Design a binder for this molecule. Sequence first.
Ligand SMILES: O=C(O)C[C@@H]1CN(c2ncnc3[nH]c4cc(F)ccc4c23)CCO1
Length: 167
Amino acid sequence: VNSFSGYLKLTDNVYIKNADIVEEAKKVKPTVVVNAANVYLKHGGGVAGALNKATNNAMQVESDDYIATNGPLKVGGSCVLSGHNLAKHCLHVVGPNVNKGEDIQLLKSAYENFNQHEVLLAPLLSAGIFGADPIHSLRVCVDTVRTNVYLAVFDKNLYDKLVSSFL
Ligand SMILES: O=C(O)C[C@@H]1CN(c2ncnc3[nH]c4cc(F)ccc4c23)CCO1
C-alpha cells in the first residue's frame, strides 16, 4: 500500500492521473520523482523548469556541480540526485528531444532507467516541449517499465485523450 491517490490504473504496474507533478510531489514526498532532463541538466522549462523552480533553484545548483564533475548525460541515460523538498531522490532521465532531431527509439532506453526503482512518480518522457507524441510515450512506458510508475499529466485535455485511446 502506498500514498498515491486518485490514479486510474492502466496495467498491473502503470497508473495515470491529471496532476501537476510539482504539487503531487510536494504532497506525496515520493521516494523518487522523475525529471524530464536534458543531457546538460539545464532545468529551464517544461517539467524540469517547474521542478527546479519549486526547489528555489537548489536542483540547478546541485546539477551544475554534477555536470562539472561528470560531464553530460547520454540521451537515454539518467542520474540519481537529491529530491530536495519534493522527494527523497530525483531521477533525472533524458528522453530524446524531437525538436533536436534525436532518435525516438532512445525513448525505450530512457524508460528502462525506471526499472532500477521500485516505485516512481514521473512525467511522460519526451512529451511536452521534447516534441514526441505522448500517446506513443505512454505505450513505450507500459511496454518497458516493470516497476510501479505513477504518471502525472499536467494537461487535463491530453490526459483524457491518453485514457480514451489506451489499448
Ligand atoms: O518533457 C516531456 O517529456 C513532457 C513534459 C511533461 N510536462 C509535465 N508533465 C507533468 N507535469 C507537469 N507539470 C508541469 C509544469 C510546468 F510548468 C511545465 C510542464 C509540466 C509538466 C509538460 C511538458 O512536457
